[model samples]
Target: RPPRFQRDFVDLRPPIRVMQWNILAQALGVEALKWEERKCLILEEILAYQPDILCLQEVDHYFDTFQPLLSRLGYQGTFFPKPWSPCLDVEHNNGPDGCALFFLQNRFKLVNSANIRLTAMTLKTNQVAIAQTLECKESGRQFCIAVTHLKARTGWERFRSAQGCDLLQNLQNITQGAKIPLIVCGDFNAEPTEEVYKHFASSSLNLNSAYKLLSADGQSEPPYTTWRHTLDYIWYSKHALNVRSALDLLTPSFNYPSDHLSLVCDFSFT
Candidate 1:
């Protein structure tokens, strides 16, 4: 379902902005980009775009590193480590990767939040979701947003879909039976046709994939999320908001700090 019309009058206001990126865990041996070098690039990109709300994943040891930066930038956020954390690595990366959610302090006020571990995804403790309800201080508009990471690996497709659906269930609960605006995003780790993708695309949930909601003329999705095969996404609540547009940042090309590029979306009240 698309966004439902809620009023007859049109307001002269700008749409809300959101950004999602994997940030990439260092454990992946291939990431030659140094954190010191990568951090500056990441900050430069973020400050340039200035999204009102940002959803991030694959945040490992650098959570602390970014926290102070986010604070200095006037944003408030939380870092939730994967449950079985204590994983170790030196030559390649940091601790177990996790998710983080941030909102510009000057723009939105945090109302409520929760960190959930999909019980059904008991196969591994790394699968988790971090959710939050934000109220736009300037407009008094309220909405929910979440960041999550599904377990990776081709063999775990079924479990991943289960986890994807589990995330929707929690989103539904937080929305509390009404069609409040909502956004769920992160590195899904599965292509659009995979079972994990189907979970949220299912009609029962009535959510909208930002990528699928492309313009009528259509557009390129690139080879992947900053690299190969589609895996990351941003799913917004169709019943409560209008999808203005969605874009993948491909500028500065290979200079990005992560394996996944940022998927940004603009939404307006319906």
Candidate 2:
């Protein structure tokens, strides 16, 4: 049976800082010419941000490269593995890559974790969604967090839209009005006006875009761009939590994290 939800109220604190990053796996390259050093450099930069909860995409499950690095920072959490592409290369052993979430041990306790499968498949691609429920140490509020990487520039926009819709449907079916806060974060590979964004925002599930919230006052200086497009995001249920601030942390000097930039948000339970 799945883990039961936590309902008791705990004195949780304010300002839970969360980050969503796409750590392009170094294992995709050959062993001798691997980009492990590049990966570590990017991680060090992310650590400098000091996020309370970190959502990562394109992780490697077989080698367990993330465990030791996160352990050194005193963070513990879970992961969801899915293939990045249909490429049967040395990186994935001809299978999906992985996505993960790293939670601060002192701030939150993980209650449950699971995956949502995407039916659409191409010659070299398969997609799956992953999420976790974290019980806040202080407030006792339960928040569900999901990390995903959708179909990349596949040209079939309608198919990708359908996949996004399917993912939202699965989340609703599983949670079934649990009333806990929900956060969906990752590299969606779609722009703000895309159908994928429309499907998510139009669903019964309420999602407040962290980017919009952060940029409300005015134009943010030194605009940052991740990938050729700004694809990273963090969306939370309106009825369950309060978003204090959000930021796109893509600086010009820091370009090695991934092909994409990281989206970070700070929130509090209502």
Candidate 3:
């Protein structure tokens, strides 16, 4: 069911809704369930939300599946494949899995986009990120939106920390020291206790975790974002934007297309 709302004031424009998720790659596993079936579920959920900006990770079939369909729906999509994706190690894989970002073509004009190969200890890693700067057609304001997947698995906390720093440096350059509003969405693969999370929490970008608003204290994250772990997030520029609403965490079921639940938020320029 759609959420109930009580507004005390009116707004000049509708909020821009953003959706982020890490769609499980087919080659990683789940061959028993065909992409043909899973893809339909993913698309259906996206159609239901109708987000203005969509960020995704673990996308292996970007060209064949996501690009064509989302393009026809009036979204301009971009995909950045990981330099050395684990998907390539799997048998009968479609391709390397990486990050994908999309925005409504009519609502925003793309200014610049970057494909970043995250590094740890001064060496490039397999994980990747995409940052796009866009100008709102109606309001004539600009903002940067990014999607990334950090290194996963246990015992890689330092790597994730370094990757977070690398991404932050790139974002600083892109946003020109937080002059442009920013939104970063990703499956960080690190918990709030990890150094990477703390790095972002204190970064100069002036970001706040949007989903935390759902918590009673407005400072706690969902108990978990996937399975028994909270691994995904939508971080926005706190001073430049206002979060009007956010979707509650989703419960997993057979109908869910991915292990990671989609995070959705509505924001307006402050």
What is the model-wide C-alpha lDDT for candidate 2? 0.68
At residue 150, candidate 2 shows an lDDT of: 82
Residue 221 miss distance in model 2 (angstroms): 14
Write model 1 residue lDDT over 25-138, tens digit each, in one string: 666524466667777667766776678888888777555677788889888988888876434545555777678888888888889989988655454455789989889888
- Worst 10-residue lDDT window for candidate 2 reads 1-10
Ten consecutive residues with minimal summed lDDT in candidate 3? 3-12
Cα lDDT computed for each candidate against the true fold: 0.73, 0.68, 0.88
lDDT of 2 by residue, 48-68 (tens): 668898888777642455677
Name the candidate, 1 or 2, with the larger TM-score value. Answer: 1
TM-score each candidate: 0.84, 0.80, 0.93
lDDT, candidate 2, residue 259?
Answer: 64
Q: Name the runs in model 2 displaced over 4 angstroms.
A: 1-13, 27-34, 83-87, 90-96, 120-125, 216-227, 249-255
Q: Between candidates 1 and 3, name the one with more favorable lDDT.
A: 3
